[PDB]
Ligand binder design. Structure first.
Ligand code: ZN
Ligand code: ZN
Ligand code: ZN
Lengths: 102, 78, 187, 293, 190
RNA sequence: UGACUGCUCCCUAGCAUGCUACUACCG
RNA sequence: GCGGUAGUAGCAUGCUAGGGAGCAG
């Protein structure tokens, strides 16, 4: 199954609450939204896969922003251990393959 | 790209108008809500612009409200 | 993790046992050395992971507190943030009617009601100086919001009607200036 | 939340739990605030206290940072590291901190009851911002020791300017003149009601009328005070004399009725700040108008 | 964790055994040392484990009983609030008209929809527009539900007073139209 | 002012089971 | 010489409890 791309983009761009117009505070919203939008990469039309790719790039940008933006004024140093899984397609491809985890 | 921009601007304008306690006047709030809901359903980009002018006139015709000149000198609106 | 006494003890035991074994020796010495070595090795190996878990947990806690503080800060500047954002997008739109009315309001000529769209209905503005009247009103027609309007009434701060012929360069500065023009939208 | 400790030049989220203005002290700065005196309680974005239900620990020196929370000594899940350790207190800006050489600024003047002359002595032996902290703490102590006296009230009324007055339960009374304006409020059953401004000096209780009043039963008069907010701009401006009379709108005529005005006019021409020491009749009557013209 | 009952015996045996070892005696004393210290640590093990289990059990019990007490306090306060609300709303029943219509019933039961219709003292009317207004509450007194009501106040959607002299056909488009009219029962209840 | 269900992702705490490892006791 | 037992550490698996978020009718 795949949803309407307009619904996913509208969920991305229009939020209730003000604290959700700062992606670094909630990165787990976009992970779920990209989980919902994965099967759009097999569609013959080309923008449909571009939605999923755009979500992955935005997730990576948000993570980089958080790490640098926190290392700068403070002095806390962040690590990128098992975090890169969220901007590669293999984490999302496993949710539509019959093997039932968690 | 010239239509989604005006829809986003209309959403922001309605939020700004709501922040200024406009819904304490039923007629003005009803007119503003009607205009905002009509802009988002538009299909061509001329009716949306005239409705945008009408909606912005509501914010401009409030003397105290905001400072047009300071908000125009902050490397913002010309 | 090379800043704990356990590491020092384990390193000294490792060096001593390694030197003794490389020199070559019997079985009892090896057994005693390993029985005195393994306890120190376990002592080191426990803290080697406990310290890592403590450090990562502290980092996560500082992250969470920074996020909470930033959200609390952000939810307290919404009015100014929204106004600045709105005027930035209004710049980026780049429309002639919007620019016209924004400049007019910035110089002092603001409306008094909602701008109508029909070929009818009344519009009222305030003109505070003679220069704005010179720019906008020329003749008997009115140009506002990239449109054309027809003047039908002029009212002063004293609410007395002023005819159009009266307003002139030197003939004006004896009047209550915040005039109120009421016009209708020309076809 | 995020304020500023400036003697150590350290942004902070911490503050002393039991002190005058909830003052802002950085990690090491809160540390020598809590070891040079007794202030064993701090406040952060969240307050430090054991989070198990029913537990109660005011102290911070023995709390631990557990599973995204805080736990304690008497009730101890100790899978953690201590909050107070290694010359510092856990918080943001735990790395970008400097400390204080003069350890006992707060420990000296924020630890007394804010009434000795030593407070003002040290306040004058301060910096601009340190003396700002001093002045704000003087206003705070003024209000906090004014809010420890009674509230006058008229319960049965008499002829105006000669009434009766009972006061409060056990509290003392402040000085007597019109220094303290008795501007309270009236209560009908639960709310506050228009009263006016009053002042009690002579007592049979003779009142002075800042306004003409028709006093009713129970009317209460007392100064109800808020707290002065922190200020964001310096008091005095640093002394920098002007290059020229650039940027002025000069005049042609010269004041003559005032015989000591022209040289001082030129001074205002190139003086940035101006204070003098004078009784009545020192230009306060006419020199202001002299500059105005 | 340092003053357990077996701690004294364990520490004394360890000290004596290690003193014997430092004395440089034969291997038999070393074997006895090893056996005694092994059994001493083995017996200290359960004494150090069971106590730690028991303390956590006791702490859990304390927490559960505290939360039970808090729940009971909350129940008591909600009961008080409900009782207060009921006894407060009781005091407006108009116990003469209600009694008059209850006694007329053949067994004491009456529909609930006719109690406000015959015993209420105040009436509220919401009017969409002027055409509906001039057909329902025109004038100063009108009739509804076989009773006579007289107007007492008129407000608008913004809750501001409106006088009947300006509710006209010409002035209609200048009002927040969801008007609310308040009246009193004439000759009967208020 | 915020209903009833269903599914999924993330973080922490506890319990149970299994794997490996280090000492010690017993035969 | 092999096994059993008692603690200790790391790792994995499934449930329960708490919190944050996403979609659908
Ligand atoms: Zn303090
Ligand atoms: Zn400091
Ligand atoms: Zn506790």
């Amino acid at each position: 199954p795949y949803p309407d791309p307009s619904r996913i983009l509208g969920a991305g761009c229009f939020v209730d609450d003000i604290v959700k117009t700062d992606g670094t505070l909630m990165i787990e919203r976009f992970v779920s939204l990209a989980i919902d939008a994965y099967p759009l990469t097999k569609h013959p039309n080309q923008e449909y896969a571009d939605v999923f790719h755009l979500y992955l790039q935005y997730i990576r940008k948000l993570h980089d922003e958080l790490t640098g933006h926190m290392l700068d004024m403070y002095s806390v140093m962040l690590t990128n251990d098992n975090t890169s899984r969220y901007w590669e397609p293999e984490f999302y491809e496993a949710m539509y393959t019959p093997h039932t985890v968690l | 790209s010239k239509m989604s921009d005006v829809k986003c601007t209309s959403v922001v304008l309605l939020s700004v108008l709501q922040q200024l306690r406009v819904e304490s006047s039923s007629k003005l709030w009803a007119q503003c809500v009607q205009l905002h809901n009509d802009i988002l359903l538009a299909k061509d980009t001329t009716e949306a612009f005239e409705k945008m002018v009408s909606l912005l006139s509501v914010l401009l015709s409030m003397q105290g409200a905001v400072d047009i000149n300071k908000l125009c000198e902050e490397m913002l609106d010309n | 993790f090379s800043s704990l006494p356990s590491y020092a003890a384990f390193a000294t035991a490792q060096e001593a046992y390694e030197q003794a074994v490389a020199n070559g020796d019997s079985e009892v010495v090896l057994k005693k050395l390993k029985k005195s070595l393994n306890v120190a090795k376990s002592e080191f190996d426990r803290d080697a992971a406990m310290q890592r878990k403590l450090e990562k947990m502290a980092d996560q806690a500082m992250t969470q507190m920074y996020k909470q503080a930033r959200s609390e800060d952000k939810r307290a500047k919404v009015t100014s943030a929204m106004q600045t954002m709105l005027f930035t997008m209004l710049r980026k739109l780049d429309n002639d009617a919007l620019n016209n009315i924004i400049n007019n309001a910035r110089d002092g000529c603001v409306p008094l009601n909602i701008i109508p769209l029909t070929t009818a209905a009344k519009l009222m503005v305030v003109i505070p100086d003679y220069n704005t009247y010179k720019n906008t009103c020329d003749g008997t027609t009115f140009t506002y919001a990239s449109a054309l309007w027809e003047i039908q009434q002029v009212v002063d701060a004293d609410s007395k009607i002023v005819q159009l012929s009266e307003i002139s360069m030197d003939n004006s500065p004896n009047l209550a200036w915040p005039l109120i023009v009421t016009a209708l939208r020309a076809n | 939340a995020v304020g500023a400790c400036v003697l150590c030049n350290s942004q902070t989220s911490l503050r002393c739990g039991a002190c005058i203005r909830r003052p802002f002290l950085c990690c090491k700065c809160c540390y020598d605030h809590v070891i040079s005196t007794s202030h064993k309680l701090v406040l952060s974005v969240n307050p430090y206290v054991c989070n198990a239900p029913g537990c109660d620990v005011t102290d911070v020196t023995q709390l631990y940072l557990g599973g995204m929370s805080y736990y304690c000594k008497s009730h101890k899940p100790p899978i953690s590291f201590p909050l107070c350790a290694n010359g510092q207190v856990f918080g943001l800006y735990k790395n970008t901190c400097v400390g204080s050489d003069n350890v006992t600024d707060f420990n000296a003047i924020a630890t007394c009851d804010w009434t000795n002359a030593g407070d003002y002595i040290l306040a004058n032996t301060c910096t601009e911002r340190l003396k700002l902290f001093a002045a704000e703490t003087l206003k705070a102590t003024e209000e906090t020791f004014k809010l420890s006296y009674g509230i006058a009230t008229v319960r049965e009324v008499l002829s105006d300017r000669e009434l009766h007055l009972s006061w409060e339960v056990g509290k003392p009374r402040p000085p007597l003149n019109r220094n303290y304006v008795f501007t309270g409020y009236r209560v009908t059953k639960n709310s506050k009601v228009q009263i006016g401004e009053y002042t009690f000096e002579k007592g049979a209780v003779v009142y002075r009328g800042t306004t003409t009043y028709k006093l009713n039963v129970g009317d209460y008069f007392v100064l109800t005070s808020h707290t002065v907010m922190p200020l964001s701009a310096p008091t005095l401006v640093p002394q920098e004399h002007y290059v020229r009379i650039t940027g002025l709108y000069p005049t042609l005529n010269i004041s003559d009725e005032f015989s000591s005005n022209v040289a001082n006019y030129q001074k205002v021409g190139m003086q940035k700040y101006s204070t003098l020491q004078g009784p009545p009749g020192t230009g306060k009557s006419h020199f202001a108008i002299g500059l105005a013209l």
